[PDB]
Design a protein around this ligand. Structure first.
Ligand SMILES: [Fe+3]
Ligand SMILES: [Fe+3]
Lengths: 137, 137
């Protein structure tokens, strides 16, 4: 009645999701993403994954969210802000972001910064995401 | 006293783990792996990730495990066995494996099949893994 087990094995790639529009927000010019493994699209559970592109100059500013997260960097170079301490990331790297850790990603290179993100959640839309500032002045 | 939050953000790559020996087993010639994000090495939690290589001809035979899993295919081509139904996978694909789904991976190509795996567990060593057969005859 409901797919489970091997009935719910599937393969995705960007071509698979050609007819899903890129997601983006006015506040983050130069950042766009698509959802590849997500319960709002697939019915999967336990892990969710998307693919993101940060154009040159793009900036995903300091924030945090309760679940742990992984980035898998597949192209380009970026600057990871580990709550003040900067580290370069590049193709071939993976990144672990502990739960509730303040972090940000900036592309100061000339190529697009491309990466997957993964959460231990059924869907992205369950993630509670907050700006790091938590004050007005 | 214990790192948490942004203190437990880190970046890994294969060079980072150069001094970790490749893992392999006599029963699976042509399969080897390393652990990149794992509580037995890093203290991370919530998600764990490794990198695996399946040489030409290598075969990760039919099995299952209770947590859901993702593969991120970074090079080569393989055959994913979805409990009897075969599907090709290749560079640029992601794979969702539902919890307890019987699955296997074979490299019938000429290049190494290279991929990350991810579980929603603190460590690989917590995963209960079983051969699919569950009978002797
Ligand atoms: Fe994040
Ligand atoms: Fe698996």
């Amino acid at each position: 009645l409901v797919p489970r087990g091997s009935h719910m094995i599937f393969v995705k790639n960007l071509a698979s999701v050609l007819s899903q529009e890129w997601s983006s927000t006015e506040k983050y010019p130069g950042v766009r993403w698509k959802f590849l493994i997500d319960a709002d699209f697939d019915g999967s559970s336990g892990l969710s994954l998307g693919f993101a592109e940060i154009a040159p100059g793009g900036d995903l500013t300091l924030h945090y969210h309760s679940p742990a997260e992984i980035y898998v960097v597949t192209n380009g170079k970026g600057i990871l802000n580990k709550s003040g301490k900067l580290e370069t990331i590049k193709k071939g790297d993976v990144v672990y972001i502990a739960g509730n850790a303040e972090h940000a990603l900036k592309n100061n290179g000339k190529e697009t910064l491309e990466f997957y993100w993964i959460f231990p959640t059924d869907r992205f839309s369950e993630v509670e995401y907050f700006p790091a500032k938590q004050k007005s002045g």
